């Protein structure tokens, strides 16, 4: 499944992220890439010899805007640095 | 005269700023230090 948050397991390299088609050119002996943080950045599908990027699922802080319970109980929620389409 | 001296004085600020990127070393250091801080912070995740 592409372009969606899935729990993925490739040959035992487990993790959670969004699998997209990549433009990376793996060498024939390289099973998987990495980032500077030693987290997996790209994997080669063992059944379909293609290269997939892995993007961690969207997340962000949650900040509550409260006028003050002494005034109202109605609140407004701020999803920091996240597009409205994923909320 | 004081007018011309101030106007010309303003102009030289442009050139000193336009040519010398190190005129803004202080601010660049602030970003660089923080950039160093985070990168080191990120890299530790690779340590056993």
């Amino acid at each position: 499944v592409k372009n969606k948050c899935v729990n993925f397991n490739f040959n035992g390299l487990t993790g959670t992220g969004v699998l997209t088609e990549s433009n990376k050119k793996f060498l024939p002996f390289q099973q998987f890439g990495r980032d500077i943080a030693d987290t997996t950045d790209a994997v080669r599908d063992p059944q379909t010899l293609e290269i997939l990027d892995i993007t961690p699922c969207s997340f962000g802080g949650v900040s509550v805007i409260t006028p003050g319970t002494n005034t109202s109980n109605e609140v407004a929620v701020l999803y920091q640095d996240v597009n409205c389409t994923e909320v | 005269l004081i007018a011309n001296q101030f106007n010309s004085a303003i102009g030289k600020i442009q050139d000193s700023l336009s040519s010398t990127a190190s005129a803004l070393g202080k601010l660049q250091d602030v970003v660089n230090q923080n950039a160093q801080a985070l990168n080191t912070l990120v890299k530790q995740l690779s340590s056993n």
Partner: peptide
């Protein structure tokens, strides 16, 4: 002249144009 692991950056309250005013 100046230039995914839980690490974010919050935006400043005042914006760059805001400062300019």
């Amino acid at each position: 002249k100046v230039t995914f692991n839980g690490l974010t950056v919050l935006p400043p309250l005042l914006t760059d144009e805001m400062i300019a005013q």
